[PDB]
Structures are given as structure tokens and as C-alpha cells.
Design a protein around this ligand. Sequence first.
Ligand SMILES: COC(=O)[C@H](Cc1ccccc1)NC(=O)[C@H](CC(=O)O)NCCCc1ccc(OC)c(O)c1
Lengths: 501, 523
Amino acid sequence: SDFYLPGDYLLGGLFSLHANMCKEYEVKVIGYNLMQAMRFAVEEINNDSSLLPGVLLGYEIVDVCYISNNVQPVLYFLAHEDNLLPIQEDYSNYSSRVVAVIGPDNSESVMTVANFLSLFLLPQITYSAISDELRDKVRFPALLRTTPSADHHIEAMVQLMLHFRWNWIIVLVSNDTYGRDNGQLLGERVARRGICIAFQETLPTLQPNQNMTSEERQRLVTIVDKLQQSTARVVVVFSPDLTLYHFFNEVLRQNFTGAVWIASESWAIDPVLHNLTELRHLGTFLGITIQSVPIPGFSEFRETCNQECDNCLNATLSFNTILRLSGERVVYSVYSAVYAVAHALHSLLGCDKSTCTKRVVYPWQLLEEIWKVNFTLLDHQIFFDPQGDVALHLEIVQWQWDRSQNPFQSVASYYPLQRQLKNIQDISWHTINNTIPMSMCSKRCQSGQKKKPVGIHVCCFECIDCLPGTFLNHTEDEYECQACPNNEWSYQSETSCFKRQ
Amino acid sequence: LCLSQQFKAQGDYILGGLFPLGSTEEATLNQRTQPNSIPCNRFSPLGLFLAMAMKMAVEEINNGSALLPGLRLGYDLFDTCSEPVVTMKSSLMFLAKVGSQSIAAYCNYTQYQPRVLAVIGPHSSELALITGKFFSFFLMPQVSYSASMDRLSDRETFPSFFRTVPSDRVQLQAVVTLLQNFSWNWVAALGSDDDYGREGLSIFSSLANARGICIAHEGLVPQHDTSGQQLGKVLDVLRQVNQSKVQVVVLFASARAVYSLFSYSIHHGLSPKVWVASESWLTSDLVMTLPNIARVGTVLGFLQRGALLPEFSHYVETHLALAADPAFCASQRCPRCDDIMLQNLSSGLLQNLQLHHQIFATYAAVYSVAQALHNTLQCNVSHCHVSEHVLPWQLLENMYNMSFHARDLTLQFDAEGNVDMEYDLKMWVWQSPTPVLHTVGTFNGTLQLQQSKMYWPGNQVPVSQCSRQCKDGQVRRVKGFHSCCYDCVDCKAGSYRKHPDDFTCTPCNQDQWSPEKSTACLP
Ligand SMILES: COC(=O)[C@H](Cc1ccccc1)NC(=O)[C@H](CC(=O)O)NCCCc1ccc(OC)c(O)c1
């Protein structure tokens, strides 16, 4: 079966195949894609004579239902091959079933596992968990990442908004940890950079095919009403893809149109939401995601409890075309994580590129080695920061709906080492003549016309003419009119005084 | 002294216990490179007192016969060391097989025998989460003092977690009820930037939105002041309060942050406001030491009303005197507990006998577990159905619908694992030569409040309104972190109200005029 492969050393793999016992939930295609990514990476390493000569690399993969079924896979990985796990003062000489764990896909599962593996210092690499809390290596000594953190995603969003001068935005978050965290983080970033959040709302947690009750429906009605009333036409959504199925259908019910939707990675490249053709009429969709790296030949490969999935293959076959036209974005993180483990093991065995000596691997030594790897995988170097992150590029993608070509066009690229957004290309807007849409609380004042604030938001101000005899030195203060010298006078609407009685 | 030797006792059923008996020496708080054991020699009296409370409860249960007639209840206590690694080490030994040094991996775990019946939970919320996710896979009941985070209410992820302290949501419900009672509709929310304020702010904002109270702004404040940037952000927050024209501030922040805020406010005065306190702040003298605090304006909050345990003091002193006896060694589970001669304790907290609430909560947790077992064995006044050895997942069914007698109080866990317990409402009296807390109401699910004892500073009730409807003659502008409020602008002469739902006062045509607050543009 697909979930197991023997070898000399076994990699543990944790993926969330099913959404929402864990078989009975609906299957998510992205998780199966990532699992196949790991399988392909191990296949390459076993075929290649260079990296681990004569040493078989195996894997053992277990399903994780989001926050469910997190303890049992860890206990299974840590057992001493006879299902017993001894308790000891010191573990330096202990030998677990797996030498490394390719950790879960979400922050809460990652932290749940890390609080366990931190005891054993069994290395955990997570490919898609973005929370910035994971940088605490006193709290999470065994944890590394092949993906940038939420810091860089929010920085990319901020620089995107600054480039197009979107001062006035709406933030929508889910009713759970991820939305709360990212909303507060964006609140931190926005305030110091001259942008203002008009209002924030917590969306209800709705199952996509559940019959929505009256209370939930009127909650959604209220949210869309607030959207319709506000002058802020730019919307940021921090939510799992599952809950947006009802929200966007309500937005369609209210005949709302004309916004720019900024998608966080959790849904920026979801093929399922992308297949809702009716979203085309809402406005422009932009999203933050990891860079595209074309894995050569992975598409051709893509063609004891909780280690099974019946629906996975049948569910994936229909999306195969869309996944093939896409850029293999998050797949690369899993592939690079497997290769990082492989290189670290290659160094730990002290292996020459002829043959390796075979010896017992205590995981803490493999963790020792993983911190030091530095190699070119396809073009990009992958090495770990002192805080455990790998500096992969991020990209801003626009959704396209011509099914014959790439569904997620890249329109900007972000560099985390430079902390800069770069190489912005032609976005095709929803506007009547493709002019850049904007969102500002108030229009730019004229010359000779001071500002006067309306409220808490620095972005909102009245424009008031300086009375005759006073002038507006904008270089000193735009909110105050200065008095002219006794030998000069000023008109109703001019910047500086002139000689007059 | 013979003290650490007292923390384990034999019995037919054994209660596990996690306590802050100490902590690792401070320099040890650095990254692990190799999975060695961790030292924890920094003894603490707080954990000692709590463990003594648990031992007292179990000894009382063994003495009497109102519970578990004719059979013996024991205990086995481990230190958390306030350290996740050591906590996990200790937590695993609870679930290890009977009389064995190992734990086994199985698919469906309702098949298994651990070496303890239930675990009296850890002190801090972080460890409460860490262990609750672990124990509830084994469905071992965990009864926690001192853990109040609302995250642990969820039955889906913490199905076996119980606690003998109210969740923070109850206190925030009391707060919102107070705000409703005084019609303070327009308020500012502040919380410490630690996790406690994070959770509190989220819960308070959601409740306020649900009940129709509009948060002007939602600011995190520094848990401690160390940099000019943190001073900058807190001063920015405080000026943002003034910009909002809010008069009532809900400050759900740990004591250090509030002390910082009020230090600045005393230095440069700000202006008097109504402050609704986190219970953790209201308990402390630290804030009240600040000079001439009456400048601040009224401080209010809700306080938990625990029962007395007077016998506990003499119990602790008796057992310490016994521990000092070298012959009592004939009567290993803690580092350096045995070094603590009585001066270290009698010069300090022993003279204090909020620690009281945790002592009572530990006592009540032990009694709750004992009552649950008493139910599961279906004991008569003199008989029990002991033919089969009980398993932890069997207690879990009985605990959701029992009631247990915590020596005077009758308590029961609600459907999501919390005790129903009431509060006092207290207000700082400043008319006396020194600040004094005085009781002016109670919350037992409804706010039974005594108006005549509210000494407001202006001798009149404060107000903070916002408009949620606007008249015919006034145009709307939205405000609030959730667009909850409006305020209405008088549309001036020469302009008119276009229609009653619009957001723009409209100038009248050049050949025409209009009165003040006009609905029409006239020849
Ligand atoms: C609490 O977080 C969340 O609820 C969301 C949604 C989620 C829940 C459970 C399992 C996966 C995702 N988390 C994220 O999106 C995390 C960020 C973080 O969690 O730090 N980035 C994953 C990006 C690639 C991805 C992989 C697996 C997918 O489905 C199995 C999927 O849809 C997307």
C-alpha cells in the first residue's frame, strides 16, 4: 500500500488527508498531493546512486485529521519497534522506529507534536506551518521549516497595498486560532505603515455542505451588509478554504461586486474554491503563496490505524489537469524537507560518495547535522536560519479562469532575505478601463487647504481652507495654518503669503 | 527534614498529582542539545502548600466513611518544574503500565490499564493545554485548579478535562453584565500582550459584539516595560483612548502591565476614567502603592468568593514539625524539599494563612474525584461493588452529572467541565486615609447589585454612549472596531439630507437655500 515502505532508516510522515475515527471525513486533494510529493522524493533518493549509496531510505506515513489524531502517530513513531516505549531519565542511547518526522501541515498540530518530540529531540520538519511562535527554539528545539513564516506573508501584503496606495482596508478572520493570530499580526504591521483598517469581523465556522441555520445566515447577512456600506473596497481574508463556500455565496446573494480580495496562503491556491465560476463577477482575487519550482517528472508520478484512504485516487483524478497546469508550489517544500533529511543523514554516516557504513542513528545527532546542511537542490540553496527557517521566495498570484492555461498567474515576487516585494507585472483588474482600483478614506486636499482629523483613523481627515491672512507651510504641518508676516497677506486658497498692507 | 518522602502513599486507587514544587535554576533556560535530564532544585513554597492541601483531603477521605467505605485511597505527586519537558516526563509515568517502567502504543486506547486513577492538574494554563491534549487521548480524567483559559472548555479537543475554578468567560460575562446595567455602551478594551490578555480580549470582544456593546479600540499593552519602543506603543495606546472620547476602560491585563500603565498615567496625569479590572490585577497591592492614585478614577472588578479552610494552617504546621523530627524518617520525590527548615516558610507565606482559593480548589478537586469513584462503585453506606477494578474512562461518565460536597459548598461540573461558582463585585474606597476594597454586589449568573453603595467620583454616574440610530436631521458616520456605532452630524444650512440612510450631507443647488438640519433644498 501507499502509506508504508521498508528500508534501513525510516522517515515518519504526517499529512492531513481528510478535512474537518478519521476515515469518514471528506478527502482534501492538497494533502494527497503533498503525500505524493514525499513519496516521489524518497523514490528519487533510492534511485540515485550519489546521495545514499547502498542505504535504503524508507518511509511510514500516518493521516492527521487536523487537530484530531495527533498523539497516536507520535507514540507509534517513538516506539522501540515492539510497540513498547521505555521511560528514562536520559535518552541519548535510545533508538526509535523513525529517525526523522516530516511534520504536520498546520501550526496547532505542529506544536502539539513538538511538545512531545522536544523530549526526545527527534528532528521535526514542517513544510507549511507559518506561525511565528515556532521560531522559539527554547520552546521548540527540534523544529525546522522549509517555508517562510507569517511575518513575511504580512510584509508582502503590506508592500502590495503600499504599491497601489490602498490606505483603507477590511480584514475578515475565521473564528479560530489561525484567523485570530494573523488578524492581530496584520493589525501590528498595518498601523506603523500608514494603512488603516476600516473594520474587522470574525466569520462563523460553517461546514461547506451543512444546512445553514437562520442565526448563522443572519450573521453572514450582517457581515456582507457592513461590507456593502463601507467605502473600503479592499478585503483581506484569513480563513480556511472550507468556510468561504457559504460566505462567497452570500456575497453573491447580496449582489456585492467591485472589491479586491487578498487571499492568505490557506486558500490562495485552493483548486476547489477556484472552481466556483461565479466568483469571477465579485472582483479581483490576489493571493500570497510560496514560489513555483517545477519538479522534473513529478506530474508523471502523481498519475496500523489511520494508514489508509479509499477515495484519494478517485478524488484526485478530476483535478489532475488543474494541478498539472499549476506550479508545484507547496510540493517543493515537502521534497526539499526529504532531501534535507537525506543530506543530513548522508553527513551523519560520515559517508563517502562510494559507500556508506551502516550504524545506529540516535535522532539527536541527526538533528545536530540538519542544522548544518547547505546544498543546491534544483536551483535554490536550502539552508536553515538560526531560527530554523529556509529562505524560499514568496509570490503574489492572480486567479485566472481560462482553463486552457495556468490558473494562478504570478504577478509579483517577494524576497525574504531582502524583505522586499519585486518585479510587479500587469494585473488585469475588474475596473471598466483597467485603471488601478483604490481605497482611501478621504481625497487628497488641495493647495492652501489644511487637514483636520475626523476620528481615530489617521487616514481620515477633512479638508479646510486656510482663512485669508494665514498660509499653509505643508513642510511644517499640514493640519495647521500659519499667520502671515505683518508686511504680507494671503488669499483664500494659496500656499504662501505675498507683500501687502 | 523528612518531607519529600511523604509525597507517595499506598492505596487501592491512586490519585496522580502535578504541582509547582519547584523550578529549574534560572541559567538552565537555554536550548537543549542532547536529551539529558533537567535539574529543578529551586524549591517553591506554593507547590508545597498545594500538595499539603491534597494530602489533607485524601487523609480526611480515609478517616471518614461518607465516601468509599472500607477501602483505601492513595496518591502519587510529581513536580511540574514549570517545564514542559519535565511535565511530559512525569505525565508519561502516570500512564505507564501497572508496576512497569514503560508505555505501549495501541490504536483504540479504551483497552488499557494505567497506574493511576486520575490526575490533579497542573497549575499554569500552558501546561494545562500540553497535558490535556495528552491525557484525553487516554481519556484519563484531569481535574485542574488554577487553569482558567477558555480554550480548555471545548469538549471536542479536551473531552476529559475538568477544573474547580471558573473559566475567564464567567468573569467577562459579569463584566459585560455590569456594563449593560450602567448603560456604558461605548468602551475601550485593553489586555496584556501575554497569552492571558490575548484570550481575554478575544472573549470580551466577542461577547460585547453579541450583547450590543461597541469596542472603540482593542489594544494590547506591554507585559513589562524595558524599552523606549514599548513606552512608545503604550503611550500611543493611552492617547488613542483619549482620542476615542471613551470614559470606561476594560483592562483585562496582568498586574505588571497595569502597574506600568498607571505609572505613566500618574506621571503625566491623563484624565480620570472608569477601569474594570481583571481579577488578577484587582487582587494586588502593587498598583495601589502608586502615589495619589485617586487621580486615576474608580477601579472596579469581580472577585471569587471561596470558602474557609482554617484547619489547614495547623495541619501544615504539624506536618512541618513532624518533618523536622529526625526519628520521623522511619515514617525521594522532590529536589531539595528536604533542605527547607521552618524559617524559610514561617518568615513568609505561612503568615498569610488568593493562595487560599487555590488551596480550596485543590481540596475540592480531590473530593470531586473521590465522589466520582464513590458513585462508580455504587457504594452503599457499608458496601461497594468492588468485584471489578475501575478504569479511568469509566469515571469519566459519572463525573459529568455528579455533585460533590467541598466541605461546605455543593459543586457540580457543567456539561463542559466547569464548576458553577459565584462572584463578589468590589470597588476601591478612596475616601478613607488608605485605599480599601468594599463589596457592592454579587454575580451568581445574575448581577444582584447594590446601587446605594456606589461612591462615584463626581457624585454622579459616569456615562459613555454612542448612537446606534440617527435622527432625520442628522447624517451618519460609522465608528468602532467592528463598525458597531454611529455618531450623527447636523447637516448644515445650505445643505440637506438626501435620504435617511445616506452617508453624505448634500449641498443645495446654487440658486436655492435650505434651513439648518433641512430635509429639502428650496427656491
Ligand atoms: C489552524 O490553521 C488552519 O486552520 C489552516 C488550514 C489547515 C487546517 C488543517 C490542515 C491543513 C490546513 N492552516 C494552514 O493553512 C497552514 C498554516 C498554519 O496552520 O500555520 N498552511 C497550510 C498550506 C498548505 C495546505 C496543506 C494542507 C491542506 O489541507 C490538508 C491545505 O488546505 C493547505
